[PDB]
């Protein structure tokens, strides 16, 4: 473990020096993203049954 503590120190030297953001901003954007893509999530917003391969679609290519 001689040079095991050496590289563990300088790994953290890197991990420490990134510029972080506030959580409220991070959560805000997460929330924003979901909201902007809710229309396009078929598990949240049903598509017509005839467009769904797993309910009523007939024609496939």
């Amino acid at each position: 473990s001689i040079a095991q503590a050496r590289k563990l120190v300088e790994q953290l030297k890197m991990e420490a020096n990134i510029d972080r953001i506030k959580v409220s901003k991070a959560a805000a954007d997460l929330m924003a993203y979901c909201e902007a893509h809710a229309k396009e999530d078929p598990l949240l917003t049903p598509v017509p049954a005839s467009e769904n391969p797993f309910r009523e679609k007939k024609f496939f290519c």
Binding site: R20, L30, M31, E40
Partner: protein
Amino acid sequence: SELDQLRQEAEQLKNQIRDARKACADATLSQITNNIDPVGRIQMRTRRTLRGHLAKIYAMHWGTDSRLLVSASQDGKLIIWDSYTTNKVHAIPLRSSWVMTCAYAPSGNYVACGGLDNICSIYNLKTREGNVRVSRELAGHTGYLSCCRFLDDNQIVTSSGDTTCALWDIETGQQTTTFTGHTGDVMSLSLAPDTRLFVSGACDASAKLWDVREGMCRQTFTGHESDINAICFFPNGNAFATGSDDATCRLFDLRADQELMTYSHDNIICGITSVSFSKSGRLLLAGYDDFNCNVWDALKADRAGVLAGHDNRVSCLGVTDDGMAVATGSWDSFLKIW
């Protein structure tokens, strides 16, 4: 002690790292989301059953076409299925019985798999001489293949019980980049949407993020109390979810450099084996060793629905790129589409 003289120094950085984050922790996602409407009882049903494997299913992965999927089983076979009809496209008998994982290349031209052979084997799905043949065996790891994902046809990333991950030039058949740091077997990896980054999750109960190109660990996320089994990227590329033996899923943010949210309940007592988000990221689907898959409101931490269709462990799942459907694989030997 030269090693002491750099151990407390490992602490005065591990504290400095807690500090900068605690300073950023001004609110919680649950507080920010406390206003928006609930998702409402997500009551999905089983729309297809895939029968064919003869023993436990350990892993599956959707093609980018949201139609074909590969599964991998204790029965020593990959099966590529067409979910729309239920037909099998290929049934691939493997050289080693002990496969644990499988992957589908974005192009649909290749599939990969591996297990205790410690090898990631790539299968050409369209041989010029119309056949399915092994086209490469990637050898280098000194432990078992636990997960793998193609960046493209000539590049793949692999996780392993030897504690490493690795990018491979498929042609050269070499590790173009190694990713060391983890102190326990690595169980899973997810590739960022831009495939410039990827996260990994390991039995050390930590998750890491890596620079695909520079080959370094940028950030290490902790909080779980036990093995991380599954890991999944949030669609926008700035967050990811993990599932643990500790009976919880957790959400981590890249730029906040910390955990936002924990999904658990006092009834849910066994480990998560698999996770992914729906297309919008609003839902987090997780698979359990209790035979169910729970559907969580990613934003509010509420349980939105359950998928109760399997008679043994739910071992894997995926959500189609088009968001149309979920696939659950199980130790009971069946996959179901929901």
